[PDB]
Design an enzyme around this catalytic site. Structure first.
Site, PDB file in Angstrom:
ATOM      1  N   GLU A  96     -11.179  -2.321  -4.338  1.00 41.25           N
ATOM      2  CA  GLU A  96     -11.629  -2.485  -2.966  1.00 41.25           C
ATOM      3  C   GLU A  96     -12.533  -1.322  -2.544  1.00 41.25           C
ATOM      4  O   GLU A  96     -12.290  -0.178  -2.885  1.00 41.25           O
ATOM      5  CB  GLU A  96     -10.429  -2.616  -2.012  1.00 41.25           C
ATOM      6  CG  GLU A  96     -10.809  -2.726  -0.546  1.00 41.25           C
ATOM      7  CD  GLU A  96      -9.692  -3.240   0.339  1.00 41.25           C
ATOM      8  OE1 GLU A  96      -8.518  -3.202  -0.050  1.00 41.25           O
ATOM      9  OE2 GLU A  96     -10.001  -3.718   1.444  1.00 41.25           O
ATOM     10  N   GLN A  98     -11.647  -8.158   2.674  1.00 38.74           N
ATOM     11  CA  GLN A  98     -10.523  -7.817   3.536  1.00 38.74           C
ATOM     12  C   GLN A  98     -10.845  -8.205   4.967  1.00 38.74           C
ATOM     13  O   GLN A  98     -11.723  -7.615   5.590  1.00 38.74           O
ATOM     14  CB  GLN A  98     -10.124  -6.341   3.516  1.00 38.74           C
ATOM     15  CG  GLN A  98      -8.885  -6.194   4.431  1.00 38.74           C
ATOM     16  CD  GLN A  98      -8.257  -4.825   4.623  1.00 38.74           C
ATOM     17  OE1 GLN A  98      -7.450  -4.666   5.548  1.00 38.74           O
ATOM     18  NE2 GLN A  98      -8.589  -3.858   3.791  1.00 38.74           N
ATOM     19  N   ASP A 120      -7.893   0.714  -3.686  1.00 40.39           N
ATOM     20  CA  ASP A 120      -8.962   0.966  -2.723  1.00 40.39           C
ATOM     21  C   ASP A 120      -9.519   2.356  -2.961  1.00 40.39           C
ATOM     22  O   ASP A 120      -8.778   3.337  -2.946  1.00 40.39           O
ATOM     23  CB  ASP A 120      -8.394   0.862  -1.309  1.00 40.39           C
ATOM     24  CG  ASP A 120      -9.448   0.863  -0.218  1.00 40.39           C
ATOM     25  OD1 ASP A 120     -10.621   1.227  -0.458  1.00 40.39           O
ATOM     26  OD2 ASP A 120      -9.135   0.533   0.950  1.00 40.39           O
ATOM     27  N   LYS A 157      -9.668  -7.618   8.060  1.00 40.74           N
ATOM     28  CA  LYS A 157      -8.800  -6.542   8.568  1.00 40.74           C
ATOM     29  C   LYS A 157      -8.403  -6.923   9.986  1.00 40.74           C
ATOM     30  O   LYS A 157      -9.114  -6.638  10.944  1.00 40.74           O
ATOM     31  CB  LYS A 157      -9.509  -5.199   8.533  1.00 40.74           C
ATOM     32  CG  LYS A 157      -8.588  -4.042   8.851  1.00 40.74           C
ATOM     33  CD  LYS A 157      -9.239  -2.731   8.546  1.00 40.74           C
ATOM     34  CE  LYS A 157      -9.109  -2.388   7.072  1.00 40.74           C
ATOM     35  NZ  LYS A 157      -7.764  -1.801   6.741  1.00 40.74           N
ATOM     36  N   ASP A 193     -14.712  -4.317   2.351  1.00 44.84           N
ATOM     37  CA  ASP A 193     -13.886  -3.836   3.443  1.00 44.84           C
ATOM     38  C   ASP A 193     -14.811  -3.216   4.495  1.00 44.84           C
ATOM     39  O   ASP A 193     -15.101  -3.850   5.516  1.00 44.84           O
ATOM     40  CB  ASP A 193     -12.827  -2.851   2.942  1.00 44.84           C
ATOM     41  CG  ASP A 193     -11.980  -2.278   4.064  1.00 44.84           C
ATOM     42  OD1 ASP A 193     -11.942  -2.871   5.159  1.00 44.84           O
ATOM     43  OD2 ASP A 193     -11.311  -1.232   3.926  1.00 44.84           O
ATOM     44  N   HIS A 205      -2.652  -0.122  -3.894  1.00 46.92           N
ATOM     45  CA  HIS A 205      -3.686   0.463  -3.027  1.00 46.92           C
ATOM     46  C   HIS A 205      -4.109   1.860  -3.495  1.00 46.92           C
ATOM     47  O   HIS A 205      -5.283   2.083  -3.821  1.00 46.92           O
ATOM     48  CB  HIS A 205      -3.292   0.404  -1.550  1.00 46.92           C
ATOM     49  CG  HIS A 205      -4.347   0.909  -0.630  1.00 46.92           C
ATOM     50  ND1 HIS A 205      -5.125   0.107   0.179  1.00 46.92           N
ATOM     51  CD2 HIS A 205      -4.741   2.179  -0.395  1.00 46.92           C
ATOM     52  CE1 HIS A 205      -5.945   0.878   0.879  1.00 46.92           C
ATOM     53  NE2 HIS A 205      -5.716   2.135   0.559  1.00 46.92           N
ATOM     54  N   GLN A 214       0.822  -1.199   0.000  1.00 47.89           N
ATOM     55  CA  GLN A 214       0.000   0.000   0.000  1.00 47.89           C
ATOM     56  C   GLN A 214       0.866   1.264   0.000  1.00 47.89           C
ATOM     57  O   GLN A 214       1.846   1.392   0.735  1.00 47.89           O
ATOM     58  CB  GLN A 214      -1.034  -0.012   1.133  1.00 47.89           C
ATOM     59  CG  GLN A 214      -0.556   0.339   2.526  1.00 47.89           C
ATOM     60  CD  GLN A 214      -1.728   0.596   3.448  1.00 47.89           C
ATOM     61  OE1 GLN A 214      -2.671   1.291   3.062  1.00 47.89           O
ATOM     62  NE2 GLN A 214      -1.688   0.038   4.656  1.00 47.89           N
TER      63      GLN A 214
END
Lengths: 411, 411
Positions: B273, B329, B238, B331, B307, B194, B172
């Site tokens: 994402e 994701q 994302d 997380k 996410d 990302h 990322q």
């Protein structure tokens, strides 16, 4: 207790190998990539991914000791060993070093560290990065073999008191010299921010005016943003020999300028690293000595730090014996085995030289963590937050290991 | 084997806690600092230093097991637990958790993980960050008590084969979406970058045209800078719900747009994402399901990743059972105990969902390292390079632990 198995695995370190000479020569860039051809031996591009080799030593008790072979960003520069690529070293280590490790006793650290520090293969001492990584793993092995922390092994073998106490930490910004300062203030960093003042026209200024304005901005920022007047950090800025370039390599004019920066710090102690680069060790020692002499004559409170041409344990001894400067950067990977760091820090401390246990953005989480133990035992005046150029990650690695370890020692 | 002593030490994590609602609303900016005042219940500033609490468990055999309590950058948002400050949590841990750890049996991991995951103190579950850190330390303790690696403990307790094999890694960039891409190409990162596409006007474009141009820039950059066509990474970007904003939550229009990006990827597989943020879990599941349905109808090769609103083990099960998207994701800090990560990954793998074992830039070297062991055992399709926003440091931490561990497993 013996090492049962030794393993070597290629990895990435936390920055890049940069051909400092090619960059100094004026290499342009395209995004993160430097253009043109490299000039330093070993380099196939001006900037290359940083690499390491992890050393794992599985002991008879099942513990796994770890260390990382790593080298500085500006490898091959200033008398240092060449850049360090895993491709070449993995077979070399498996062939020549694995048999010297397997079956080796690790109840003590120093004899093993000395053995590898002086070993020659095909006539050549092992690369400093190899000695660095092997010695980290051997220290960790002695620790894991005996229920001690790495710090304790150092205190035991060097007969040091091991009083639990933090070491001042120094954050480096890279070229992100404004944003990184804010990060460092938010995280209460003891010493900051390096600032990578490595260009005359744009970073130092042709008359030092840009750096002057930066120091003022820096002290203003600290005084403005700090959450309490109790926060009084030290300023430490690395100028990569640029001050010498604008003052005709005249130590007196260099000292005058450096002294003039004190006012801009607004009461925060100021250190200037690498004020000049004389291009070789004997001339570098003489030059720093002369700057120090003039700073004293002026009654300046500003201190200077040796770095370039001060690589090995013996180099550090030589800079110290000459009374050449106030502080020396013990740039850890360049000393080879980490026992040399301990000896260097102790030598500095004995003789009144401030020991800065430095390192590189281009090393690893393991090498940095191991260095924390060396520092907690040996007691340098300052320790670099490393590795990486993001700062946050290095602080997490260094500060937290330091505080975890102090807490363990206190039990 | 029992825990003899439990220590908790304050530290800094590898990023910052940001007050999400204070920002997207209108908090000003000054360098790295946000101005104005937070609205989110625990914040003293819109942006504050990220903090962690290290857990050290000294076992009867003298080994020291470690884990770090850490929380996401945007804590207190999207249904996540509040920001996590050591000042509050160290006394909490010493008062409520230390008495539950000292003398505790660590011969197994899962019972302890489940115990702390469901424990209620004054009616409330422990903060997810506490469960996260404790569970890391408890896994490490079981490992160190028995001469096993953490990954082996997971494989033993879940009856998994632990085939020593890498997991694809995802880097990322933060806002450094151009420079970081070059770093990632140089270091051969499997999945990237990302790109933090978190602003309509400046990053996505009011009609998605800026992101379209970025995908083309990105694939062109990879194809130009790579050393050979053997480097064929996956693209994962994302967008923080911004696609939903520009299409007023019309899933068909969102899908049309997402599908249109495939051309710009030049054969590199593309994942988007967080295409939309419906503001709550039930609506989020329905919206993603509709986007996925339309992408499939169009014959698009672009995939979407859940996410927001997919936080806990049960949330992951719900998104998976709905067939709502191609990937989720997981997380990690938000799941609490890390045994939940294992269960979540296995559930995804059994039910046709790609598991992305994610995390946060605001966690630590220890939490990331521990996550590597979880991934090597459970086998997600993707793992986040973390912590930090510098990228290099996270790669060093995650990639090198992964390869070290594979080497150990092969012994």
């Amino acid at each position: 207790m013996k090492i049962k198995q030794a393993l070597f695995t290629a990895g990435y370190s936390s920055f890049y190998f940069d051909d400092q000479q090619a960059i100094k020569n004026g290499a342009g860039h395209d995004g993160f990539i430097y253009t043109g051809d490299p000039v330093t031996p070993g380099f196939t591009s001006v900037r290359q991914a940083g690499e390491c080799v992890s050393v794992q030593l599985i002991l008879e008790n099942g513990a796994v000791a770890v260390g990382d072979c790593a080298a500085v960003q500006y490898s091959g520069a200033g008398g240092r060993d060449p850049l360090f690529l895993a491709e070449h070293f993995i077979p070399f280590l498996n062939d020549h070093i694995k048999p010297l490790l397997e079956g080796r006793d690790v109840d003590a650290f120093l004899p093993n560290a000395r053995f590898f520090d002086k070993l020659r293969i095909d006539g050549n001492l092992l690369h400093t990065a190899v000695r660095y990584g092997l010695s980290q793993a051997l220290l960790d092995a002695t620790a894991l073999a005996s229920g001690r922390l790495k710090t304790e092994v150092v205190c035991d073998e060097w007969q040091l008191p091991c009083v639990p106490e933090a070491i001042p930490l120094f954050g480096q910004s890279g070229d992100d010299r404004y944003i990184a300062v804010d990060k460092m203030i938010l995280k209460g960093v003891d010493v900051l921010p390096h600032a990578l003042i490595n260009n005359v026209e744009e970073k130092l200024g042709f008359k030092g005016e840009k750096l002057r304005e930066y120091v003022r901005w820096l002290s203003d920022r600290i005084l403005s943003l700090r959450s309490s007047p109790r926060y009084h950090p030290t300023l430490h800025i690395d100028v990569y020999g640029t001050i010498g370039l604008i003052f005709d390599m005249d130590p007196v004019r260099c000292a005058e300028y450096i002294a003039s920066l004190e006012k801009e710090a607004q009461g925060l102690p100021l250190y200037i690293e690498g004020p000049v680069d004389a291009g070789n060790k004997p001339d570098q020692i003489r030059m720093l000595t002369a700057i120090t002499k003039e700073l004293t004559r002026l009654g300046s409170g500003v201190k200077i730090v040796a770095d370039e041409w001060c690589n090995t344990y013996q180099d550090i001894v030589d800079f110290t014996d000459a009374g050449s400067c106030h502080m020396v950067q013990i740039k850890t990977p360049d000393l080879g085995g980490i026992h040399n760091i301990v000896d260097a820090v102790l030598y500095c401390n004995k003789h009144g030289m401030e020991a800065y246990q430095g390192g590189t953005c281009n090393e690893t989480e393991i090498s940095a963590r191991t260095c924390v133990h060396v520092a907690l035992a040996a007691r340098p005046m300052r320790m670099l937050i490393k590795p990486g150029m993001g700062f946050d990650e290095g602080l997490n690695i260094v500060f937290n290991e330091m505080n975890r370890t102090i807490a363990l020692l206190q039990t």
